């Protein structure tokens, strides 16, 4: 009751206020509406996750820009950021070989203990981290892939030119996830901010598995768009 | 500390990979005592696992190892067949219906004059009796004046649209994002209030390129996920 109108005014204070506007202090809001101070957290955290507010860990919480959009599709992260007026940067967090547990093997259609190239990228937009993306490929199926990536910006450019392998279909899973400590750290958010967790099974033009990708997108700043028929 | 979070989460994880669904998790206070870790940490690890779909919270009962999340293909077509595949049977329950006054965005979506009346429908979707989602459809009252009376005579909003009007969903744009369960939502779904949801916004067009519906929906993030086929 006291909660709804609170949310309603706050929701209406976005819409119109431009990003950067500081949100009134949580303890001020509790009195300005004679509501409990936890009822204020709730309303605010909803509006952070719903993307109208944004928490800056040193500074505070402010009216936010709309969430960044990306199409549910095998497509360019760079082209989509740019189309929205955002400079896209990436950062190679790690790249190394590992050995699959039995299921990563099931995914990659390789033997337990099989060697796997792993790649972790931090995706940025205007220099603000948005996602962490971890890609797994069968090292044996792609003998010297890492060494070849030196001379390439796009992993999928590398696979097409060098291995004559093109992504042709993917099964993709979208679900919720809380930001783990390691995740929150790389992304500069709270533990555990709600996340969009994407899992991608990709197969090429002759139908064999190419990669398995595990990705978490900031739930406060990100959304995905799908376009459907009939 | 940090190690304690890892060890507690490693442990419960292994429990989920080696015990059958339904296997009961000790209550939070037991875990804190057995792991000599703050209740904060225990709640966090528990919460990560529930949202990931590994553990399931049941309000009056407790936490258990879970069956996997319910999956639904992103597609205009049948919610029902896919549900029946995974071993669930879908049922719905009309929660509310009536007319409301459109805001400017709603008017923009539905292509009407702000203040124009909007038929609003609200259903609760369950799987094996268990609440999964709240689905809220918005249609232009001016465009479909006869629609609301029609509904009682049809199993589906869309056959109604196809029957009374010659109106068919041709295309749609769907947005997926994160949301926290509001108190009304948590109430109707039988979940906690802070629960991460998958919020689905749908904007549908008929064959002639005209807006038909705007649908806002929430799926409980602990029991639910979406699958898309990309090509």
From Swiss-Prot, chain B:
Cellular component, GO annotation: cytoplasm
SUPFAM superfamilies: Chorismate lyase-like (SSF64288), Winged helix' DNA-binding domain (SSF46785)
Gene3D superfamilies: Chorismate lyase-like, Winged helix-like DNA-binding domain superfamily/Winged helix DNA-binding domain
Reported phenotype of the disruption mutant: Deletion of the gene results in a bald phenotype, mutant fails to produce aerial hyphae and spores on glucose-containing media. The mutant is arrested at an early stage of the developmental program.
Domain of life: Bacteria
Induction / repression: Induced by (GlcNAc)2 and (GlcNAc)3.
UniProt cross-references to CDD domains, sorted A to Z: WHTH_GntR
Subcellular localization, as worded in the UniProt entry: Cytoplasm
HTH gntR-type domain segment(s): 1-68
Pfam families in the cross-refs: GntR (PF00392), UTRA (PF07702)
Activity regulation, free text: Binding to the target genes is abolished by GlcN6P, a central molecule in N-acetylglucosamine metabolism.
Main function: Global regulator that is part of the nutrient-sensing system. In the absence of glucosamine 6-P (GlcN6P), represses the phosphotransferase system (PTS) specific for the uptake of N-acetylglucosamine (PTSNag), and genes involved in the metabolism of chitin, as well as several genes involved in development, thereby linking carbon availability to morphogenesis. Also regulates the expression of the ABC transporters DasABC and NgcEFG, which are involved in N,N'-diacetylchitobiose ((GlcNAc)2) uptake. Binds to the DNA consensus sequence 5'-ACTGGTCTAGACCACT-3'.
Descriptive protein name: HTH-type transcriptional repressor DasR
Annotated organism of origin: Streptomyces coelicolor (strain ATCC BAA-471 / A3(2) / M145)
């Amino acid at each position: 009751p006291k909660y709804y109108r609170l949310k309603k005014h706050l929701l209406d204070m976005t819409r119109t206020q431009t990003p950067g506007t500081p949100v009134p202090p949580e303890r001020t809001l509790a009195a300005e509406f004679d509501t409990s101070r936890t009822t204020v957290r709730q309303a605010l955290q909803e509006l952070v996750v719903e993307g109208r507010l944004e928490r800056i860990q040193g500074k505070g919480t402010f009216v936010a820009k709309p969430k960044v959009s990306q199409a549910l599709q095998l497509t360019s992260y760079t082209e989509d950021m740019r189309a929205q007026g955002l400079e896209p940067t990436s950062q190679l967090l790690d790249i190394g070989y590992i050995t699959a547990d039995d299921r990563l093997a099931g995914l990659l259609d390789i033997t337990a203990g099989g060697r796997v190239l792993r790649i972790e990228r931090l995706r940025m937009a205007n220099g603000e981290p948005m996602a962490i993306e971890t890609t797994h490929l069968s090292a044996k199926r792609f003998p010297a892939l890492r060494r070849s990536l030196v001379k390439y910006t796009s992993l999928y450019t590398a696979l097409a030119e060098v291995y004559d392998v093109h992504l042709a279909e993917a099964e993709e899973t979208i679900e919720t996830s809380l930001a783990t400590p390691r995740e929150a750290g790389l992304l500069g958010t709270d533990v555990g901010l709600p996340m969009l967790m994407l899992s991608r099974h990709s197969q090429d033009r002759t139908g064999q598995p190419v990669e398995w990708v595990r990705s978490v997108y900031r739930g406060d700043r990100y959304k995905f768009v799908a376009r459907l028929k009939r």
